[PDB]
Ligand binder design. Structure first.
Ligand code: A1IZ3
Ligand SMILES: *[C@@H]1O[C@H](CO[C@@H]2O[C@@H](C)[C@@H](O)[C@@H](O)[C@@H]2O)[C@@H](O[C@@H]2O[C@H](CO)[C@@H](O)[C@H](O)[C@H]2NC(C)=O)[C@H](O)[C@H]1NC(C)=O
Ligand SMILES: *[C@@H]1O[C@H](CO[C@@H]2O[C@@H](C)[C@@H](O)[C@@H](O)[C@@H]2O)[C@@H](O[C@@H]2O[C@H](CO)[C@@H](O)[C@H](O)[C@H]2NC(C)=O)[C@H](O)[C@H]1NC(C)=O
Ligand SMILES: *[C@@H]1O[C@H](CO[C@@H]2O[C@@H](C)[C@@H](O)[C@@H](O)[C@@H]2O)[C@@H](O)[C@H](O)[C@H]1NC(C)=O
Ligand code: NAG
Ligand code: NAG
Ligand code: NAG
Ligand code: CL
Ligand code: CL
Ligand code: CL
Length: 527
C-alpha cells in the first residue's frame, strides 16, 4: 500500500508491473477547484485541502470537447478521442514514479495537443509508466480546459479573460513545484514536453513570466506558438466571443452580463455552437485558442521571440516528415483515407482555398507557383504530395524551424530533429507517410513492449529516442553515449544542423526545407 502526503491531503496510488519491474501510478490527482458554476470561464482557483485519503487509482474525467466523428469505428482516428467521461470537472493530473521510490528524480511533464479544442492526458499513447520504469524519471501529465471553456476571451474582463487552459497548465506546474519532492522528484529538474497544441503551449510557457520559475528545460514536438494557428488576435477573439453569444441567444450590452448568461448554458450548447463562431475557417479551425491577454502573455509573442524576451534554457525541437497529410482528409476535395487520393490541378487549387480561406487570389497563386514546378510533370501523385507539403510546411515545419533559429540566437543550446519513420502498425494509408502525431508513441516507449507487434528495429529506435529525451531532461544534452550513436549537434542559425530519426542510419543534415521556408517565412506573411 503506497500513500503519499501532499500539501493538500493524502493520496493513494497503485502498483503496475512493467518489464518485470514495478511502477507506482497516481492517476487522477485534482489540482484545482473544479471550474463549475460561477467559476466557468475564470482562471483556475486553488485547491481546498482534504483530510481523507484520495484514491488516485483511475484516470479522471476529460474536459468537455467536441469529438472527431469523421471515421466511426476506425482506430486511426478513434484512438485520439477521449477515453474517460467528459465533464467540466476535469482539472486533474497523473504521476508515474519509479519503484523503488527515487531519491531526487528528474521530472517530465506532458502537455497533450489537439488544436486547443480537444485532447486528454489519459490516452494510452501518453501512458507514462514505460518512461518511469526504463529511465527512472518521474512523468506527470495534466488535463486542461480546451475550446471555448478554456480560451473564450473578453480581453481585460476577468470573468472571461482568455488563456484559462494555459493557466490550468500553469497551476499544474506549480503543483509539481510544491508536491513532487514528496514523490521523490526534483523540483529543480523539470522538463516540459508536448506535441502540436501541446508543443505550442510549452513554447508559450517559455515566454510567460509566471512560468519562468516552474520548469527547467523544454521539448517541442511538431508545434510552436508562431505557427499560424496557435494565437488568436484580440480582434478575432472578440468577434468569436460575440458570435458565440449571438448563436446561444446570450448577446447583451454589458459584457459581464454576457458571461453571466453564458454561465447558465449547458456545455453541449456551448460545444455545438463553437464550430460556427468563425465565418470561413480552415478544417479543424482553432476557434478558441491562446490570446494576448496581458496576464499569461504580456505582448504579441512574435515580438517577445524577436527581442529575446523569454526563458534562457535549452530546447529540443522537432517535426515529422509528413506533418500535413493527416489534415487533407478533413476537407480537401479529392482526398480519402480509403484510396491513393490522386488529385488534379483543379483539385489542388480547390484545396488551397480550403486551407487558405482568407487569403487573396494572388497569395494562393504564389503557393501554387512555388510548389508546382515539377521534377516530372507526368508523375500522377504530384498534386497530392504538393498539397500535403504545403499544409505541413506552412503550419508546422517552417514555424518550428523559425522558432529554433530565433531562440538560439540568444545563446542557448537548441537541438532539432526530423522524425522520418512510419510506424509498421500504422492504420492510415501509405500515401500519408510519416504522420503528424505518430512519433509520440516512440517517445513514450510503446515499441519497447515486445507484445505490441512492433518490429525489432522500432524497439531499438524507441529505446534510443527514450534515452536521448531522458538525457536531455536530466542533463540538457540529447545524446546516447553508450551505443556508438551519432552525436546530436547543437542547432545554430548559421549552420542549422539537425538530426534525423529513423530505424536505419541516423544522419546529420543542414537547412531543412530551406527553399520552402524562405517562401513561407519571408514572402508569404506580406500577402
Ligand atoms: C490530425 O487529424 C488526424 C489525427 C491523426 C494524428 C493526430 N490527431 C490526434 C491529435 N490531434 C491533432 O493532432 C490536431 C491538430 C490540429 N492542428 N490544427 C490547426 C491547423 C488546422 C488546419 C491544418 C493545419 C493545422 C487543428 C488541430 C486539431 C487536432 O485535433 C483534432 C480535433 C478534432 C478532430 F475532429 C480531429 C483532430 F485531429 C488525429
Ligand atoms: C465577425 O463576425 C460576423 C458575424 O457573422 C457570423 O456568421 C455566422 C456564420 C455565425 O457565426 C454568426 O454567429 C455570426 O453572425 C461576420 O459577419 C459575416 O461576414 C461574412 C464575410 O466576412 C459575410 O458573408 C456574412 O454575411 C456575415 N454575416 C453576418 C450575419 O453579418 C464578420 O465578417 C466577422 N468579422 C470578420 C472580420 O471576419
Ligand atoms: C477517392 O475517394 C474520394 C472520396 O469518395 C468517397 O470515398 C471512396 C473511397 C468511395 O467510397 C466513394 O464512393 C466515396 O464518394 C473520391 O472523391 C469523390 O469523387 C466523387 C465522384 O467522382 C465526387 O462527386 C465527390 O465530390 C468526391 N468526394 C470528395 C470528398 O472529394 C475520389 O474521387 C477518389 N479518388 C480516387 C483516385 O480513387
Ligand atoms: C536535489 O538536487 C538539487 C539540485 O538539482 C540539480 O541542480 C538543478 C539546478 C538542475 O540542473 C538539476 O537538473 C540538477 O539535478 C539539490 O539542490 C537538492 O537539495 C537535492 N535534494 C535532495 C537530494 O533531496
Ligand atoms: C480507497 O480504497 C480502499 C480499498 O482499497 C477503501 O478502503 C477506501 O474506502 C477507498 N476510498 C474511497 C472509495 O474513497
Ligand atoms: C455590468 O454589470 C456588472 C455586474 O453587475 C457591474 O458590476 C458593472 O458595473 C456593469 N457595467 C456597466 C457598464 O453597465
Ligand atoms: C544499446 O545496445 C544494446 C545492445 O547492444 C541494447 O539492448 C540497448 O537497449 C541499447 N541502449 C540504448 C540506450 O539505445
Ligand atoms: Cl458534459
Ligand atoms: Cl501539370
Ligand atoms: Cl539557408
Amino acid at each position: 500500500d503506497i500513500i503519499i502526503a501532499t500539501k493538500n491531503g493524502k493520496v493513494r496510488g497503485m502498483q503496475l508491473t512493467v518489464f518485470g519491474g514495478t511502477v507506482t501510478a497516481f492517476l487522477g490527482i485534482p489540482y484545482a477547484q473544479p471550474p463549475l458554476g460561477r467559476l466557468r470561464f475564470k482562471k483556475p482557483q486553488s485547491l481546498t485541502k482534504w483530510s481523507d485519503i484520495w484514491n488516485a487509482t483511475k484516470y479522471a474525467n476529460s474536459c468537455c470537447q467536441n469529438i472527431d466523428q469523421s471515421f466511426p469505428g476506425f482506430h486511426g482516428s478513434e484512438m485520439w478521442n477521449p477515453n474517460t467521461d467528459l465533464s467540466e470537472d476535469c482539472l486533474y493530473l497523473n504521476v508515474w514514479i519509479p519503484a523503488p521510490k527515487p531519491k531526487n528524480a528528474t521530472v517530465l511533464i506532458w502537455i497533450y495537443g489537439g488544436g486547443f479544442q480537444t485532447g486528454t492526458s489519459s490516452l494510452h499513447v501518453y501512458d507514462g509508466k514505460f518512461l518511469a520504469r526504463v529511465e527512472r524519471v518521474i512523468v506527470v501529465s495534466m488535463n486542461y480546459r480546451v475550446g471555448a471553456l478554456g480560451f473564450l476571451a473578453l480581453p481585460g474582463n476577468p470573468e472571461a479573460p482568455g488563456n484559462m487552459g494555459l493557466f490550468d497548465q500553469q497551476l499544474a506546474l506549480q503543483w509539481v513545484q510544491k508536491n513532487i519532492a514528496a514523490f521523490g522528484g526534483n523540483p529543480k529538474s523539470v522538463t516540459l514536453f508536448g506535441e502540436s497544441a501541446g508543443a505550442a503551449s510549452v513554447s508559450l510557457h517559455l515566454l510567460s513570466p509566471g512560468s519562468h520559475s516552474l520548469f527547467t528545460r523544454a521539448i517541442l514536438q511538431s508545434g510552436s506558438f508562431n505557427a499560424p494557428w496557435a494565437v488568436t488576435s484580440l480582434y478575432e477573439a472578440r468577434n468569436r466571443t460575440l458570435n458565440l453569444a449571438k448563436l446561444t441567444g446570450c448577446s447583451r450590452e454589458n459584457e459581464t452580463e454576457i458571461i453571466k448568461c453564458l454561465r447558465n448554458k449547458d456545455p453541449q450548447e456551448i460545444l455545438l455552437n463553437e464550430a460556427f463562431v468563425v465565418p470561413y475557417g480552415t478544417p479543424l479551425s482553432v476557434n478558441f485558442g491562446p490570446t494576448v491577454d496581458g496576464d499569461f502573455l504580456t505582448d504579441m509573442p512574435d515580438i517577445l521571440l524577436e527581442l529575446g524576451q523569454f526563458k534562457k534554457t535549452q530546447i529540443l525541437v522537432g517535426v515529422n516528415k509528413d506533418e500535413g497529410t493527416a489534415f487533407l482528409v478533413y476537407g480537401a476535395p479529392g482526398f480519402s483515407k480509403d484510396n491513393n487520393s490522386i488529385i488534379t490541378r483543379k483539385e489542388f487549387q480547390e484545396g488551397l482555398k480550403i486551407f487558405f480561406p482568407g487569403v487573396s487570389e494572388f497569395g494562393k497563386e504564389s503557393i501554387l507557383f512555388h510548389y508546382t514546378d515539377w521534377v516530372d510533370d507526368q508523375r500522377p501523385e504530384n498534386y497530392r504530395e504538393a498539397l500535403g507539403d504545403v499544409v505541413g510546411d506552412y503550419n508546422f515545419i517552417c514555424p518550428a524551424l523559425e522558432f529554433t533559429k530565433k531562440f538560439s540566437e540568444w545563446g542557448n543550446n537548441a537541438f532539432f530533429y526530423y522524425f522520418e519513420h512510419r510506424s509498421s502498425k500504422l492504420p492510415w494509408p501509405e500515401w500519408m507517410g510519416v504522420m503528424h502525431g505518430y512519433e509520440i508513441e516512440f517517445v513514450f516507449g510503446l515499441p519497447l513492449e515486445r507484445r505490441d507487434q512492433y518490429t525489432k528495429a522500432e524497439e531499438i529506435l524507441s529505446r534510443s529516442i527514450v534515452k536521448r529525451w531522458a538525457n536531455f531532461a536530466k542533463y540538457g544534452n540529447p545524446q546516447e553515449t553508450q551505443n556508438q550513436s551519432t552525436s546530436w549537434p547543437v542547432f545554430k542559425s548559421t549552420e542549422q544542423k539537425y538530426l534525423t530519426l529513423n530505424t536505419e542510419s541516423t544522419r546529420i543534415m543542414t537547412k531543412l526545407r530551406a527553399q520552402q521556408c524562405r517562401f513561407w517565412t519571408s514572402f508569404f506573411p506580406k500577402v
